[PDB]
Each structure stands twice: as structure tokens, then as C-alpha cells.
Amino acid sequence: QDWNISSSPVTPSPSAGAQKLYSFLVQNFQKKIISGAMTLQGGDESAQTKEPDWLQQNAGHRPALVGLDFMFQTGKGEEWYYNDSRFSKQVVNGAKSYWQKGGIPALCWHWRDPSKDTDAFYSPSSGNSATQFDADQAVKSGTAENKAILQDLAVIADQLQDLRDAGVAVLWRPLHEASGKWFWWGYKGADALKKLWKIEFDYFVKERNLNNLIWVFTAGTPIEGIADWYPGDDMVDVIGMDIYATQGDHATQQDYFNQCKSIFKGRKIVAMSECGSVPEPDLAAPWSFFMPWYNNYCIPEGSNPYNSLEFWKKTMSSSLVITLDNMPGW
Numbered sequence: 001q002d003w004n005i006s007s008s009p010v011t012p013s014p015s016a017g018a019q020k021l022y023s024f025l026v027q028n029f030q031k032k033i034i035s036g037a038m039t040l041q042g043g044d045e046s047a048q049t050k051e052p053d054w055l056q057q058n059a060g061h062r063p064a065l066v067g068l069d070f071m072f073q074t075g076k077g078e079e080w081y082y083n084d085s086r087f088s089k090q091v092v093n094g095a096k097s098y099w100q101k102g103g104i105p106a107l108c109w110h111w112r113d114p115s116k117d118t119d120a121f122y123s124p125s126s127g128n129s130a131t132q133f134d135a136d137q138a139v140k141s142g143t144a145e146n147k148a149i150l151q152d153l154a155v156i157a158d159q160l161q162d163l164r165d166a167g168v169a170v171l172w173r174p175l176h177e178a179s180g181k182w183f184w185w186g187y188k189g190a191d192a193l194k195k196l197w198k199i200e201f202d203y204f205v206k207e208r209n210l211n212n213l214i215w216v217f218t219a220g221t222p223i224e225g226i227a228d229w230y231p232g233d234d235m236v237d238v239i240g241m242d243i244y245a246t247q248g249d250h251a252t253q254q255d256y257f258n259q260c261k262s263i264f265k266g267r268k269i270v271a272m273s274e275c276g277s278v279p280e281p282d283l284a285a286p287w288s289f290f291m292p293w294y295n296n297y298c299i300p301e302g303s304n305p306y307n308s309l310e311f312w313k314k315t316m317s318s319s320l321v322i323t324l325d326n327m328p329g330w
């Protein structure tokens with residue numbers, strides 16, 4: 001079955017930066033694999049680039065992609081972050097900085113309980129301290145939940161607008177891992193998820209004129225029945241998988257790659273939007289990019305690390321792998 005990927009992103013009149021980023025992904029897809037690393041946001045300034053910095057010093061190159069999260073930008077009790085000058089622009093500045101170096105900012109958002117009754121993003125089926133926030137109500141005009149999500153969306157849009165006005169484009173991966181139902185946005189199932197995606201997509205793209213985003217839909221794990229969760233080809237640019245293999249297992253995850261090609265009819269670039277152990281670079285399973293999670297998921301610890309020093313040295317020197325030093329500059 002053929003690939004059938006659009007040369008333009010879904011956003012009408014994408015920014016110059018977004019079209020360059022999207023074209024870079026299209027032209028490298030199936031030929032090279034873009035290296036990435038997640039970072040941990042919060043009150044630790046020093047630590048904001050620790051994973052890319054470790055990779056530079058130990059493996060000889062920074063990843064081409066850096067991950068950042070708006071999780072503290074809104075939420076009950078998070079004023080220490082979103083009202084502090086040291087932290088209220090941490091995500092924008094991190095994204096700006098990496099873009100200016102020629103890298104790819106990949107943004108997500110562990111979206112805390114929009115009601116502000118709790119500070120939680122985890123759902124009642126997660127096994128963790130949960131929010132009761134009801135996505136089915138959030139997608140209905142005129143409910144308290146709807147008002148709450150629109151307030152939070154305005155705050156995040158303000159940040160993304162700062163990026164837009166600076167010429168920065170990003171991978172934007174909202175409402176992620178919905179199918180696991182462990183976050184409130186997926187907890188009510190596919191119907192509310194798709195309606196939330198549309199509310200956000202329309203608000204960002206149409207109402208706020210945010211033309212600088214490349215939209216990443218996270219298709220699993222779990223992948224079963226994901227077709228019913230898909231927002232549609234007109235609101236997604238990239239299919240991302242979040243696959244956490246056994247610790248130390250660098251299997252290529254070929255079967256998940258093939259499933260994303262089949263399920264989405266070859267219409268979208270396929271990426272490993274989160275992982276623990278990184279899939280071995282392999283053009284038979286050519287993830288557009290990979291992104292291990294932060295801390296020990298990237299920087300090795302112990303005798304069976306997720307990504308050992310020797311694995312990283314090999315991976316970041318491979319001709320298959322794009323590092324920050326291979327980027328053209330935007």
C-alpha cells in the first residue's frame with residue numbers, strides 16, 4: 001500500500017516557519033530519523049536543558065528535537081509557576097531558544113483539571129490521584145466545564161501566539177494518550193475526545209490565528225480501536241505513538257509502525273512521540289522522530305538503563321539519525 005502524504009500541513013496559510021518545519025519532516029520521512037529528548041519543566045532553571053546537554057557532552061551531539069510541557073501554565077495551586085517571571089515564560093523561552101539554534105520544539109500539555117477543584121490531570125481509572133472533570137460536559141456550549149476549558153485554552157494560546165510572533169513553529173501534541181483513558185480528556189471515550197480536539201483546533205487555528213503549529217495526534221498505546229478516536233485528516237499532521245517497551249529493549253517496534261501506516265491509510269507521517277528505550281534506527285521502521293521521556297528515561301542510570309551511554313553514542317553518530325548539527329537553520 002502506497003504512502004499518500006500531503007506536502008502542506010492542515011493549517012490554512014501556515015507560517016513560513018511551520019511550512020519549513022513540515023516540509024523538513026516530509027522530505028526526511030522514510031530516509032532519516034530525527035533524534036529527540038523530553039525535558040522536565042518546573043522550578044529548576046538549571047535542569048531545563050539537562051537531557052540535551054547530557055547528550056552533547058556524552059554522545060557528541062544535541063538532539064534535533066526538544067520536548068516541553070505546559071503542565072504548570074494553568075491549574076489549581078500552580079501560581080508559583082505561571083505568575084513568576086522566572087517560570088511564566090519557561091516553555092516559550094525554551095522553544096524559542098531551541099528553534100533559534102535550528103532545532104524542533106515539540107510541545108505537549110498535561111492539562112490540569114480545568115475546574116481548579118483539584119490540580120490533577122489523571123482520571124478516575126488511572127490509579128492515581130484524580131480529577132472528576134467531565135470531558136462530555138466540557139464539549140457542550142454553556143456548561144461550567146466548557147467555560148473552564150476555554151479559559152485555559154486562552155492562556156495556552158497566548159503562549160503559542162508569543163511563539164507565532166517570534167517566527168517559531170512547533171510540533172503541538174495536545175490531548176495525548178487519550179485512548180488509555182488515564183487522563184481526563186480521554187476518560188469519557190472517543191466522542192468527547194474528538195469534540196475537544198475540534199474545539200481546540202478551531203479556537204487555536206481560526207479564532208486565534210495560530211498558524212505556526214504542526215498537529216500531532218497520539219494514536220496509542222493502546223492502539224486498539226484508535227480509528228474511532230481519530231479527529232480526521234483535516235486536523236492532524238502527524239501520527240505519534242507513545243510506546244514504553246521493557247526497560248532496555250531497543251526493538252524497532254516495526255509492527256506498531258506498520259499499523260499506523262495501515263490504520264491511517266498512509267496519509268500521515270508516523271513518529272515515536274514518546275518512548276523509554278529508543279527504537280533502534282532502522283529504515284524498515286523509520287519513525288519520523290523519537291523522544292524518550294525525561295530524567296532516567298534519557299540519561300542512563302543503573303545496570304540496565306533505558307538508553308545506555310553506548311547506545312546513545314551509536315545512535316547519535318549514525319548516518320540515519322538527524323541531530324541538531326544536521327539541521328539547516330530555519
Ligand SMILES: *[C@@]1(O[C@H]2[C@H](O)[C@@H](O)[C@H](O[C@H]3[C@H](O)[C@@H](O)[C@H](O[C@H]4[C@H](O)[C@H](O)[C@@H](O)O[C@@H]4CO)O[C@@H]3CO)O[C@@H]2CO)O[C@H](CO)[C@@H](O)[C@H](O)[C@H]1O
Pocket residue numbers: 042043069071080110119
Ligand atoms: C511545587 O510542587 C511541584 C513539585 O515541586 C514538582 O516536583 C512537581 O512535579 C511533578 C508534577 O506535578 C507531575 O505532574 C509530574 O507528572 C509526571 C508523571 O509523574 C510522569 O513522569 C509522566 O506522566 O509525566 C508527568 C508530567 O510531567 O511529575 C512531576 C515530578 O517529576 O509538581 C508540583 C506542583 O504540581 O514546587 C515548586 C518549586 O519548588 C514550589 O514553589 C511549589 O510551592 C510546589 O507546590
Ligand SMILES: OC[C@H]1O[C@@H](O[C@H]2[C@H](O)[C@H](O)[C@@H](O)O[C@@H]2CO)[C@H](O)[C@@H](O)[C@@H]1O
Pocket residue numbers: 026027028029030031
Ligand atoms: O522532491 C524530490 C522528490 O521527492 C519525492 O518524495 C520523497 C519524500 O520527499 C521523502 O524524501 C521520502 O518520503 O521519499 C520520497 C521518495 O524519494 C517525490 O515523490 C518526488 O516526486 C520528488 O521529485
Ligand SMILES: [Mg+2]
Pocket residue numbers: 231232233234
Ligand atoms: Mg472530519
Ligand SMILES: [Mg+2]
Pocket residue numbers: 282
Ligand atoms: Mg537491523
Ligand code: NA
Pocket residue numbers: 220221222223224
Ligand atoms: Na497497544
Ligand code: NA
Pocket residue numbers: 300301305307308309310
Ligand atoms: Na550506561
